[PDB]
Design a binder for these strands. Structure first.
Lengths: 158, 122, 50, 118, 86, 203
RNA sequence: CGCGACCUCAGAUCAGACGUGGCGACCCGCUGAAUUUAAGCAUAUUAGUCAGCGGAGGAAAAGAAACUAACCAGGAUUCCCUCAGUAACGGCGAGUGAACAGGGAAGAGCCCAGCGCCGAAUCCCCGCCCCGCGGCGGGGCGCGGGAAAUGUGGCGUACGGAAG
């Protein structure tokens, strides 16, 4: 029975809600688990970026967010073709591909091509056979300055 | 007497049966002494004779199996006792070579496009 | 009854061998908890199941 | 050739016998009820020692699985003696008791010295 | 006569010893165990009795195989090899 | 190509040709037992699509499912509850009769594993489905890298858990505005998360 | 009438293998109440909940759009923060109640069938020997058997693809 002047409210506690209570004492141990599983990942991919592959410049949809720029899923196939990148050689040298991304616009298309000219110029590539150099691989000294990049590779600022 | 396994494992097949039944008789001369109720020293002995029959029958059962898996080793089928008793679910898994079987097409995708050792410049 | 099955006669046979007291030397041990056999069952007191 | 009966009964097809490519178990499981493992101990009871001196028998305690035939070899093999008959009863304790009546060419009270009961 | 006098006529049993679970609940007319259901391949167990479950689960008996699985697990179920002799 | 000619020939089931073939086979299939091994697929073409290769180790059963809706199994039609739950006659089983067919074939042959199934005829009393089964232990499947996925113990009784085609069509999953109630793994997983107090440590 | 192929079926203690049962905290498919709440009660609510049934696994399931959207567009699934006690449902009463976008954890992509080409180019099993394997595997060896044109293997799958 309601007392006086006071808010009308409908508490969602009419089910057997106590059985399905998720308590967050996992949280401080989870952040230790997620961190050790993130360092030991980065220590495996020893000169590669720790965040992993480059993501494209991508506009947010639906008019609330459409002035902002994200990291998308991966580069469109009309962004890889114009960059001279093969769609299946892309994944292997650390370039994100999705076959889904359309291109309704030229500036958002051209934004992600200049994005990839940066990457391939920034790309240090180690020979598969180390003690015999191959052509497309970068110079001896560029393998010797080679360090990981902690953080998202070419980070996206609006 | 102190009977060991080290000296039984380098003996002939027929002698261990005679060494067994010589203890079977010796054990059956003490199970009488237990019921008659005489000589307390002939009751502490009875555990020495029981555990030593367990030695003689073991060295028999041991070397009668290391002979089987010496003859049956170079055979495609071998008896279920001589097969590896790893867990039931572990036996149902694929072979070491059956997991090494990739497709002819996945030996082309992984051929042309090997996962490259690369870095970037900060 | 007198008319028994072999399985029931082996059941009773265990229950008789379990209805003897503790040996007098058992509570002279170091870890001495046992005073007497608490599981002793009598044919008027408790009727064995069945 | 015509169907002599109006019922089609299944024709007697050929069957082959088991030719194993490997034996299922590596060896035959050994005879665990030995002549030593079948007779546990002779009773040295006053009623038993009476039965040995009065009725030309021996009283053994036998493994519960034993036949009257297995005992008739068990007492023959281990004591170099012959048996007239065997009378087995399972005690309230749950163990078998063989009244091994010896044939009169041997002496029961004299062979009680051999087994070592008095 | 429904009470004390009627207890006198109790001389013929219904349940004998069941032979999967030793539990004296094998009904002789029905020929099924009230505790495990013997002729059924599947163990009779229900979730309205979480106390009757823990009386007869893996933590009850020996685990005469299931304990030497736990002991042999910690060395990756190794088979055949012996420790290097003296 | 021969298969495309059989493909559209099975889309004219109303035809004079297929009003005879589906009618004389639907006769034939009633006289054989409720659940028996077919020596081959009745449709080679349809089984092609559903992953049946005609090599050694692939098994096709031809099982029948008694037709119609599921009525509430209650004594003398009395449901001891509120006027809502009185219903017994006009109730419908959640899974399709095709998925019911697969989990009778799959139940019978526990050694085998249900790949998929397809329709081969209906009566007023019986729908007939060919259920495709694969040996997880025959070395033609077991040594093929593209069919060795079925042999893993994860795919034990796909028919029962509803991981076969007809098995999945009653779960009500898929993507978009229509399939919100099965976001997450399933209907039960959606219900679970949505009905959890995420009582954080702090608040 | 006979011998032969084949189709469709039997039978075997035939040669090899495989399923059953348990555990069941978590997980998947069904089935499925009433207490209770509405100050009565029948729809609702409790609740697709307890109980019943089947099925797994080390996680399961889901999963690479027959998607979201309406923007200057995003781009598998899963989970977390939020949207939000919001849109909406409801004797519109009691009560129920998502999703997108966004911010993160992780991030991985793919294979057939169909359509076509390559002398079925494919595959299982037995016998023989050889290094050799307590995950029966690699090589030779036989006008040895079988599977298979009622379609096996390669190329190839929507991002297009093949051939010259």
């Amino acid at each position: 029975a309601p007392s006086r002047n006071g808010m009308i409210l409908k508490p969602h506690f009419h089910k057997d809600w106590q059985r399905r209570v998720a308590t967050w004492f996992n949280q401080p141990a989870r952040k230790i688990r997620r961190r050790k599983a993130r360092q030991a990942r980065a220590r495996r991919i020893a000169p590669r970026p720790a965040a992993g592959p480059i993501r494209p410049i991508v506009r947010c949809p639906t008019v609330r967010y459409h002035t902002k720029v994200r990291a998308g899923r991966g580069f469109s196939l009309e962004e890889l073709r114009v960059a001279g990148i093969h769609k299946k050689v892309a994944r292997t040298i650390g370039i994100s591909v999705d076959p889904r991304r359309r291109n309704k616009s030229t500036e958002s298309l051209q934004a992600n091509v200049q994005r990839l000219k940066e990457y391939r110029s920034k790309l240090v590539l180690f020979p598969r056979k180390p003690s015999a150099p191959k052509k497309g691989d970068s110079s001896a000294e560029e393998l010797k300055l080679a360090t990981q990049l902690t953080g998202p590779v070419m980070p996206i600022r609006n | 007497a102190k009977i060991k396994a080290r000296d039984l494992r380098g003996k002939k097949k027929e002698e261990l049966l005679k060494q067994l039944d010589d203890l079977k008789v010796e054990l059956s001369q003490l199970r009488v002494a237990k019921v008659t109720g005489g000589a307390a020293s002939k009751l502490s002995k009875i555990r020495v004779v029981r555990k030593s029959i367990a030695r003689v029958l073991t060295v028999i059962n041991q070397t009668q199996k290391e002979n089987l898996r010496k003859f049956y080793k170079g055979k495609k089928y071998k008896p279920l006792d001589l097969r590896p008793k790893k867990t039931r679910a572990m036996r149902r898994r694929l072979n070491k070579h059956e997991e090494s079987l990739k497709t002819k097409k996945q030996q082309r995708k992984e051929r042309l496009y090997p996962l490259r050792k690369y870095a970037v410049k900060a | 009854s007198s008319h028994k099955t072999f399985r029931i006669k082996r059941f009773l046979a265990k229950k008789q061998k379990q209805n003897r007291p503790i040996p007098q030397w058992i509570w002279m041990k170091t870890g001495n908890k046992i005073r007497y056999n608490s599981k002793r069952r009598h044919w008027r007191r408790t009727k064995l199941g069945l | 050739k015509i169907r002599t009966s109006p019922t089609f009964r299944r024709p007697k097809t050929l069957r082959l016998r088991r030719q194993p490519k490997y034996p299922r178990k590596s060896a035959p499981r050994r005879n665990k009820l030995d002549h030593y493992a079948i007779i546990k101990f002779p009773l040295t009871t006053e009623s038993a020692m009476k039965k040995i001196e009065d009725n030309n028998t021996l009283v053994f305690i036998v493994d519960v699985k034993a036949n009257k035939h297995q005992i008739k070899q068990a007492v023959k093999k281990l004591y170099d003696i012959d048996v007239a008959k065997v009378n087995t009863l399972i005690r309230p304790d749950g163990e078998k008791k063989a009244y091994v009546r010896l044939a009169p060419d041997y002496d029961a009270l004299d062979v009680a010295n051999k087994i070592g009961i008095i | 006569t429904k009470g004390t006098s009627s207890f006198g006529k109790r001389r013929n049993k219904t349940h004998t010893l069941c032979r999967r679970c030793g539990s004296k609940a094998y009904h002789l007319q029905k020929s099924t165990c009230g505790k495990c259901g013997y002729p059924a391949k599947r163990k009779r167990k229900y979730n309205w009795s979480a106390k009757a479950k823990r009386r007869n689960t893996t933590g009850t008996g020996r685990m005469r195989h299931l304990k030497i699985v736990y002991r042999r697990f910690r060395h990756g179920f190794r088979e055949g090899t012996t420790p290097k002799p003296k | 190509g021969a298969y495309k000619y059989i493909q559209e020939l099975w889309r004219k089931k109303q035809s004079d040709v297929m009003r005879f073939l589906l009618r004389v086979r639907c006769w034939q299939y009633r006289q054989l037992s409720a659940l028996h091994r077919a020596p081959r697929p009745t449709r080679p073409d349809k089984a092609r699509r559903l992953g049946y290769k005609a090599k050694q180790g692939y098994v096709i059963y031809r099982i029948r499912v008694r037709r119609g809706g599921r009525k509430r199994p209650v004594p003398k039609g009395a449901t001891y509850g509120k006027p809502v739950h009185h219903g017994v006659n006009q109730l419908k089983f959640a899974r399709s009769l095709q998925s019911v067919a697969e989990e009778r074939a799959g139940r019978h042959c526990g050694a085998l594993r249900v790949l998929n199934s397809y329709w081969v005829g209906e009566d007023s009393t019986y729908k007939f489905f060919e259920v495709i089964l694969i040996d997880p232990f025959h070395k033609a499947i077991r040594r093929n890298p593209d069919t060795q996925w079925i042999t893993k113990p994860v795919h034990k009784h796909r028919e029962m858990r509803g991981l076969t085609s007809a098995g999945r069509k009653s779960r009500g999953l898929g993507k978009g505005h229509k399939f919100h109630h099965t976001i997450g793994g399933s209907r039960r997983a959606a219900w679970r998360r949505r009905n959890t107090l995420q009582l954080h440590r702090y608040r």
